[PDB]
Amino acid sequence: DKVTVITSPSTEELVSLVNSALLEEAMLTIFARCKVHYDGRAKSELGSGDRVIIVKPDGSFLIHQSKKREPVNWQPPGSRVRLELRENPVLVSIRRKPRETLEVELEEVYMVSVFRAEDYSEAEMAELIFENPEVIEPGFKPLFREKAIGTGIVAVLGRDSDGNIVVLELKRRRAELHAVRQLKSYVEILREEYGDKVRGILVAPSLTSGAKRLLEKEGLEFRKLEPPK
Amino acid sequence: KVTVITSPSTEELVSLVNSALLEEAMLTIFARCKVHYDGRAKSELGSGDRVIIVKPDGSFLIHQSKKREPVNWQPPGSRVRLELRENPVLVSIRRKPRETLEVELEEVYMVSVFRAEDYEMAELIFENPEVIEPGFKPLFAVLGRDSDGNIVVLELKRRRAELHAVRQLKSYVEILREEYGDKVRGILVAPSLTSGAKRLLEKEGLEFRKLEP
Incomplete structure (x- = not known):
């Protein structure tokens, strides 16, 4: 009712x-x-x-x-x-x-x-990805997590189904533009070293539409994940 | 719709x-x-x-x-x-x-x-005097006669009645009380009154009737 x-x-x-x-x-x-x-x-x-x-x-x-x-x-x-x-x-x-x-x-x-209307920690995300890699991509193999170099940013390095390097930037909150910029930078470093096979992926519950725009424009990707609570 | x-x-x-x-x-x-x-x-x-x-x-x-x-x-x-x-x-x-x-x-x-998009009376009283009260005789604000043969004062307003003409009605019925005394009555005619106008109207003894142009 x-x-x-x-x-x-x-x-x-x-x-x-x-x-x-x-x-x-x-x-x-x-x-x-x-x-x-x-x-x-x-x-x-x-x-x-x-x-x-x-x-x-x-x-x-x-x-x-x-x-x-x-x-x-x-x-x-x-x-x-x-x-x-x-x-x-x-x-x-x-x-x-x-x-x-x-x-x-x-x-x-x-x-x-x-x-009738009623009223009214990004590490666990990473460990969740490690526990079930099938969340992000099919045949996704996570390798390692890394955090806090010059910043508070967290990242997940791994390999995809076809062998390419994959970076995952995780955001607890909604994903802003800034996150996409940082992901882009990581990706361009990884590109500079290991070659252009590498693709980055944003992991966060959602994003500002501007963030999605920047994502599709710089060739990056997005993946939906909800932090446990 | x-x-x-x-x-x-x-x-x-x-x-x-x-x-x-x-x-x-x-x-x-x-x-x-x-x-x-x-x-x-x-x-x-x-x-x-x-x-x-x-x-x-x-x-x-x-x-x-x-x-x-x-x-x-x-x-x-x-x-x-x-x-x-x-x-x-x-x-x-x-x-x-x-x-x-x-x-x-x-x-x-x-x-x-x-859907959407929204964004004188005295003669009407003369013609059909039963509008105010049954057995009402209009004379000449507006002056009239209630069937008991009494002076009846009317102050007419067009839109919602606040308390101004209630004070006016009070004073009018007061001087009409100076001449012709007791049982002389003022009446507030308007489509709607206000709570304040209503109360001042009721306490001081005046009355009210519903009339719209």
């Missing part, structure tokens, strides 16, 4: 999902043609128009119009939300301290949705 | 995203996702359930289950494209300054497409 969705709901349906959401501490999201009234210190009035309404379990109220960025009207966490029936169903958000009120009259509700 | 799909295969996802991009419609997707944001400015957030809203103007909004502001967002005047990968990724490109915001969609709960 992760997501409930009712498209063009009825009154009893709307009240059902809305109240169930409010009670169950879930995220309520409603796409609607509505009319907006903000009564308070800074007065605001919005007429009929298509809007997205977002009500968080902590009380946060958000009204998003068709454009821009920020909400056209919003209420802070800790505020109070309730659905009261009138000629058309009305979503009332009461912020306290200071006490101000935001009423959203729902003219037509196109969609109502209840979204 | 609204097109929704629950637990989509990547075909459905990419289809609906392309539909949002083509038709200039609002794209809303509830998903458990992993959030990467990179550039000269850097932000990284792990797995969790989030709501993803892409507006036709290029605005990108990623909302978590709490607080208020988006957990990550991209300004209006940007570029959003969905690319298939290990898991399908929404990539929002901001240029000048150039930074990029990608969400890896691990589990996609729903995908939705949504």
